[PDB]
Ligand binder design. Structure first.
Ligand code: YM9
Ligand code: ZN
Length: 353
């Protein structure tokens, strides 16, 4: 039961040295790309967005797949929602007080995502070739660039517009942490900046809202108690449940590699469902380390329900469905529903040794 879950968690620890060295290779490549993008007039205010756990700017998305975000401070930014999508926006500038460094990417009033991505991709592709003394290649809206380091490690590089303004209206009912992390913490988190990433909706100049930077703020300060996991009397299994849910999807994805039916599912879907389970189970006593087996079942059941009902609300944008047929086809969801159902009813044979 939970002894099998705990053995899985022990096994995961053994691949820590390999993830850390890969993250170090990622950190080096990313830091060189930063100095070159800073030379460019359009990207001088660019910087590494702190989202990860490995050297601040390196987020792990799969065994050897890293996600790195570059942020660009964009002041006096006005947003216009694209046709009731709630997550996709056209990007404009308030009222021309002085000619901005991003004026080259303008298309009327709207700032062009593909035009900025083109210069971003062109500066990036240059650093791989100009300094060929490194072992990097390009492989293919956002992630903007996928870099393959020594034919093994892949880094997804995302360009993000930074906005220090109030969060859009579509997020008003999102981040439902009040009963768990408090209204005080919800208020404080909503004062932090938000990001826009050039993800296409069909192919246009829309930008998707991104709250990836908020994850580290909650994952590492996850309890109702401020001292949750800071002493021996307060040990919860929230982080372990998230690792097991990610592990579960990774193992299922690899097992169905022959027909690739699970290709569309990602750790982002698992994290979103995990964080909805934290909202439903707000007390630290609902995540006692001794109750690992039940807490994991709570996570799997909720994820199963999302799949079956074909609905997984974005944690920040409740009217944005990550599981709509627009994003993931009916057959793929029905397929994962069956696999997760079997795994749950059979005490997770995919975790067997
Ligand atoms: C409580 C919490 C939950 C989630 Cl799901 C996220 C989050 C959000 C985005 C995003 O694009 O908006 C992510 N993109 C890749 N990983 C992401 C993680 C952040 C949080 F603070
Ligand atoms: Zn804890």
């Amino acid at each position: 039961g939970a002894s099998k879950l705990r053995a899985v968690l022990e096994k995961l620890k053994l691949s820590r040295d390999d993830i850390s060295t890969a993250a170090g290779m990622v950190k080096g490549v990313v830091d060189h790309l930063l100095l070159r993008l800073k030379c460019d007039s359009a990207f001088r205010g660019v910087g590494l967005l702190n989202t990860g756990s490995y050297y601040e700017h390196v987020k792990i998305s799969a065994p050897n797949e890293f996600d790195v975000m570059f942020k660009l401070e964009v002041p006096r930014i006005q947003l216009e929602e694209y046709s009731n999508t709630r997550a996709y926006y056209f990007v404009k500038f308030k009222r021309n007080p002085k000619e901005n460094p991003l004026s080259q990417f303008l298309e009327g009033e709207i700032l062009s995502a593909s035009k900025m991505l083109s210069k971003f991709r062109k500066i990036i592709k240059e650093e791989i070739n100009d300094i060929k003394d490194t072992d990097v290649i390009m492989k293919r809206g956002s992630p903007a660039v996928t870099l393959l380091i020594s034919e093994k490690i892949s880094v997804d590089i995302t360009l993000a517009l930074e906005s220090k303004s109030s969060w859009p209206a579509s997020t008003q009912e999102g981040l439902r942490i009040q009963n768990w992390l408090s209204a005080k913490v919800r208020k404080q988190l909503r004062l932090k900046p938000f990001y826009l990433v050039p993800k296409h909706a069909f192919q246009e100049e829309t930008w998707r809202l991104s709250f990836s930077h908020i994850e580290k703020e909650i994952l590492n300060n996850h309890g109702k108690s401020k001292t949750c996991c800071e002493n021996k009397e307060e040990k919860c299994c929230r982080k372990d449940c998230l690792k097991l849910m990610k592990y579960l999807l990774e193992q299922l994805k690899e097992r169905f590699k022959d027909k690739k039916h699970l290709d569309k599912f990602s750790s982002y879907h698992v994290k979103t469902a995990f964080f909805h389970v934290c909202t439903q189970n707000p007390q630290d006593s609902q995540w006692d380390r001794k109750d690992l087996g039940l807490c994991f079942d709570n996570c799997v059941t909720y994820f199963l329900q999302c799949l079956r009902t074909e609905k997984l609300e974005n944690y920040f944008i409740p009217e944005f469905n990550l599981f709509s047929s627009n994003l993931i086809d009916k057959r793929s969801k029905e397929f994962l529903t069956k696999q997760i159902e079997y795994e749950r009813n059979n005490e997770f044979p995919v975790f067997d040794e």
